Amino acid sequence: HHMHEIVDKNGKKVQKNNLNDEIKIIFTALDGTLLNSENKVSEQNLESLIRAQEKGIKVVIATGRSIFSVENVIGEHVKKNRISLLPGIYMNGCVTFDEKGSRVIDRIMNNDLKMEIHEFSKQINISKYAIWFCLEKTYCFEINDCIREYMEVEALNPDVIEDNMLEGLTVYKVLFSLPENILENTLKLCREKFSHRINVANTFQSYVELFHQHTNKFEGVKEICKYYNISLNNALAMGDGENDIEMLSGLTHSVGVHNASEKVKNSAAYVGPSNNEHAISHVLKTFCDI
Ligand SMILES: O=P(O)(O)OC[C@H]1O[C@H](O)[C@@H](O)[C@@H](O)[C@@H]1O
Ligand SMILES: [Mg+2]
Known about the structure:
Structural class: alpha/beta
Bound molecules: 6-O-phosphono-alpha-D-mannopyranose, magnesium ion
Number of domains: 2
Shape: globular
Oligomer: monomer
Radius of gyration: 19 Å
Name: PfHAD1
Order of helices and strands: EHHEHEEEHEEHEEHEEHEHEHEH
Keywords: C2 HAD, sugar phosphatase, haloacid-dehalogenase, mannose-6-phosphate, unknown function
Distance between the termini: 20 Å
Entry title: Crystal structure of PfHAD1 in complex with mannose-6-phosphate
Strand content: 15-25%
Strand order of the largest sheet: 8-7-6-9-11-10
CATH class of the largest domain: Alpha Beta
PDB class: unknown function
Largest sheet: 6 strands, mixed
CATH architecture of the largest domain: 3-Layer(aba) Sandwich
Assembly: monomeric
Number of helices: 10
CATH topology of the largest domain: Rossmann fold
């Protein structure tokens, strides 16, 4: 079967003996890539991560999430030191930590732009779907089934605040948890209004994230590789969503998971197993020989 294979653009399996780069470090998206559809690390993936640690391969989370929600989803693994959150790439790069928890990237949204996005969101009536991200906390203006759905998957609940409190907050990103029915049009409206102003990414399902326009996960990847004196050619990125495209196309070695959109797969060097098929386990086997 094709379930566990990794192949190049021509559909040929990638072979270890044809690789000329040692892979020292793996950057992975969490939801949709490392985590299966139940938001869990599969046992096969876990087993391979244990081997990766034994061999000194670094595995770095690269996510739109804050480090706080990541710890809420995978905390049992973090507590056992099976997955390290420091260094890590959070909020799509806008908060990137080194191993001491220092921010090697801190990209705060300009406050005028924040308020312009806020007012625009109230004008097109998606403000009720907004989750605003400060460094340590998240905020929303109400709770509805879309906010509920975000809370369930995110596993970290925003505080409910009044509209007028946003002005005083210092924010990195906003995430809109949208109804499916308005996603496509809302995405168009945000991209037309905010081009050359902010990044606009449809990250998972109906979620739309806006974050500093010059930052993305690959910027985080470069800083963490720099930290460890690792050439980009010794790094591999794996991902599923729009917010992974820069890191997949920026690294010579990159793997889109089978469940990714064609657009995301196009940006990646190789296509691997789906997130439900233990993708990092097979990446580790192919690139690192386990
Ligand atoms: O960046 P990652 O780790 O792939 O996860 C991204 C996803 O995280 C969670 O599932 C949600 O917040 C989604 O809105 C988001 O798209
Ligand atoms: Mg993802």
